């Protein structure tokens, strides 16, 4: 059983996860015999040649990656030739046959998160290379949810009267004395982006950042860790699970030279999706074996250019098998719908704290936003006083008021002044 090997030249950790997936899921019943191709993914021509090459070799299924420029070629060709395509790459909008998309939809999780933080007005940064789909989603929801959204393309922030035009924009959004920004680019590029944001904005304080990716813990957060800024994100890989922890240990045990970038405490979510893809294909072929359906091709597939193009009938069955597969994996529960989209997926909501990244809850299709919660100032100067007029008096309604805000008088204002000059936080007690 031969399968397609389409890979970007810069894909290494995903390649390593692919090989590890092959070794781990290897069985005596059947051989997967993967044929690896290294090509430029953005080029439509190269993708066409690679796909037609895999078709010439007569592979049963194909695994690869696609950029927003090369997507429609893959969808159209796999659609016409009835060949199954499995990918970690971003999920296509709308319904498509013969394509299996490993990564869960990030739209719903993002919307639910924004709604959970109760943001009325915010800025959304985007890169035109990755695509506007999520932006289109949040804009579509912006009208109904009463959101005021400043959409900034990270592509050119460079001049526009230099800092002067964009600074007004960037610091306009300050509301709670907190500025709110959603990133959604890619990890490294995101670090560069937030740096550039601090540069052009000239304001370093009061940021609440939302990184939109399944890769929240997959990169170094130390540079963005303390600006005094809140950082929230999404994690598709839960390390609390036994499978993931074991895999992490063995992954960390591996040598560096044999598998490129093979050993790290964490793992790229796309790589994990490639591993999961290997497992899913294995299970699909095994299920094709158990159901006694013959998927083996009698003759050569031929040329993809040939007209009219000849699809294989059993290919439909292969697709069916791939869609019927439900297994446990690094991305959580893996199940597929009739369109190929992920279902039942669980996306972890993360907040970055002093002690490092933690999980505040999870998001699901049916469950929407679910907070885990379950859980103290460092120093507080205690100020004692007695209630007397007009030194310390109770406000008219102190019942709906909490803390020190319910005490007013000469001594209160005086305390505020003293604590302002000496620079300590205080608590008024009677």
Ligand X SMILES: *[C@@H]1O[C@H](CO)[C@@H](O)[C@H](O)[C@H]1NC(C)=O
Q: Residues interacting with ligand X, by CB under 6 A?
A: 332-333, 344, 346
- Asked if 242 interacts with a copy of itself (CB under 8 A), we say no
- Please tell me the number of Cα atoms within 13 Å of 262 on its side-chain side: 15
223/398 with CB nearer a copy of itself: 223
Task: Find which of a copy of itself, ligand X, none residue 346 binds, CB within 5 to 8 Å per kind.
Answer: ligand X
Tokens of 57: 């070799």
Pairing of strands 407-408, 393-394: antiparallel
- Asked if 339 interacts with a copy of itself (CB under 8 A), we say no
- Asked if 428 interacts with a copy of itself (CB under 8 A), we say no
- Asked if 343 interacts with a copy of itself (CB under 8 A), we say no
Pick out residues in 80-109 that bind a copy of itself (CB under 8 A). 80, 93-94
- 269-290 vs 314-324: helix crossing angle, rounded to 10: 120
The C-alpha atoms of residue 344 and residue 340 are separated, in whole angstroms, by: 13
Pairing of strands 84-87, 61-63: parallel
| Binding residue for a copy of itself, selected from 1, 35, 129, 139, defined by CB under 8 A | 139
- What kind and span of H or E run contains 179? strand 179-182
The C-alpha atoms of residue 217 and residue 220 are separated, in whole angstroms, by: 7
The 348-387 contact track toward a copy of itself, x by CB under 8 A, reads ------xx----------------------xx--------
The C-alpha atoms of residue 229 and residue 239 are separated, in whole angstroms, by: 25
| Binding residue for a copy of itself, selected from 23, 118, 176, 399, defined by CB under 8 A | 176
- What kind and span of H or E run contains 180? strand 179-182
Neighbour-count burial for 297-319, b at 16+ CB within 10 Å, e otherwise: eeeebeebeeeeeeebebbeebb
Task: Find which of a copy of itself, ligand X, none residue 344 binds, CB within 5 to 8 Å per kind.
Answer: ligand X
| Binding residue for a copy of itself, selected from 171, 252, 300, 429, defined by CB under 8 A | 171
Number of residues that this document lists for the chain: 430
- Asked if 205 interacts with a copy of itself (CB under 8 A), we say yes
315/332 with CB nearer ligand X: 332
In the complex, least distance from residue 332 CB atom to ligand X, rounded to whole angstroms: 6
In the complex, least distance from residue 366 CB atom to ligand X, rounded to whole angstroms: 8
121/289 with CB nearer a copy of itself: 121
- Asked if 172 interacts with a copy of itself (CB under 8 A), we say yes
| Binding residue for a copy of itself, selected from 28, 242, 296, 307, defined by CB under 8 A | 307
109/123 with CB nearer ligand X: 109
Task: Find which of a copy of itself, ligand X, none residue 254 binds, CB within 5 to 8 Å per kind.
Answer: none
Task: Find which of ligand X, a copy of itself, none residue 325 binds, CB within 5 to 8 Å per kind.
Answer: none
- Asked if 143 interacts with a copy of itself (CB under 8 A), we say yes
Bridge partner list, 342: 336
- Asked if 204 interacts with a copy of itself (CB under 8 A), we say yes
The C-alpha atoms of residue 267 and residue 244 are separated, in whole angstroms, by: 10
Q: E-assigned strands of 301-420?
A: 327-329, 332-336, 342-343, 347-353, 356-364, 368-371, 381-384, 393-394, 407-408
């Amino acid at each position: 059983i031969q399968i397609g090997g389409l890979f970007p030249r810069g894909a290494d950790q995903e390649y390593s996860a692919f090989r590890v997936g092959m070794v781990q899921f290897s069985t005596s019943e059947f051989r997967l015999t993967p044929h690896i191709d290294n090509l430029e993914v953005a080029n439509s021509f190269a993708v066409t040649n690679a796909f037609c090459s895999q078709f010439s070799r007569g592979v049963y299924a194909i695994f690869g990656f696609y950029d927003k420029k090369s997507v429609n070629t893959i969808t159209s060709f796999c659609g016409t030739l009835h060949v199954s395509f499995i990918t970690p790459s971003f999920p296509t909008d709308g319904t498509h046959p013969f394509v299996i998309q490993m990564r869960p939809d990030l739209k719903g999780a993002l919307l639910s998160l924004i709604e959970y933080y109760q943001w009325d007005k915010f800025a959304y940064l985007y890169d035109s290379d990755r695509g506007l789909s999520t932006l289109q989603a949040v804009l579509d929801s912006a009208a109904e949810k009463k959101w005021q959204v400043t959409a900034i393309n990270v592509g050119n922030i460079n001049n526009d009267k230099k800092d002067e035009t964009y600074r007004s924009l960037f610091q306009d959004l300050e509301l709670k004395k907190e500025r709110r920004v959603i990133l959604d680019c890619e990890r490294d590029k995101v670090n560069d982006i937030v740096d550039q944001v601090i540069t052009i904005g000239k304001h370093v304080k009061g940021y609440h950042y939302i990184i939109a990716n399944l890769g929240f813990t997959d990169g170094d957060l130390l540079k963005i860790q303390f600006g005094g800024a809140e950082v929230s994100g999404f994690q598709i890989v839960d390390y609390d699970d036994s499978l993931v922890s074991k895999f992490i240990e063995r992954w960390s045990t591996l040598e560096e030279k044999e598998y490129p970038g093979a050993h790290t405490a964490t793992i790229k979510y796309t790589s994990a999706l490639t591993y999961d893809a290997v497992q899913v294909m294995t299970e699909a072929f095994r299920n094709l074996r158990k159901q006694r359906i013959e998927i083996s091709r009698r003759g050569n597939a031929g040329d993809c250019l040939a007209n009219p193009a000849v699809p294989w009938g059993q290919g439909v069955e292969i697709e069916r098998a791939l869609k019927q597969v439900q297994v446990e994996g690094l991305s959580g529960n893996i199940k597929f719908d009739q369109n190929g989209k992920r279902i039942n997926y669980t996306i972890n909501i993360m907040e970055l704290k002093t002690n490092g990244p933690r999980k505040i809850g999870y998001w699901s299709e049916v469950d929407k936003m679910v907070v885990t919660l379950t859980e103290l100032e460092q120093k507080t100067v205690v100020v004692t006083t007695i209630l007397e007029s007009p030194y310390v008096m109770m406000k008219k309604n102190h019942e709906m008021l909490e803390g020190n805000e319910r005490y007013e008088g000469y001594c209160v204002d005086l305390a505020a002044e003293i604590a302002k000059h000496c620079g300590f936080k205080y608590k008024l007690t009677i």
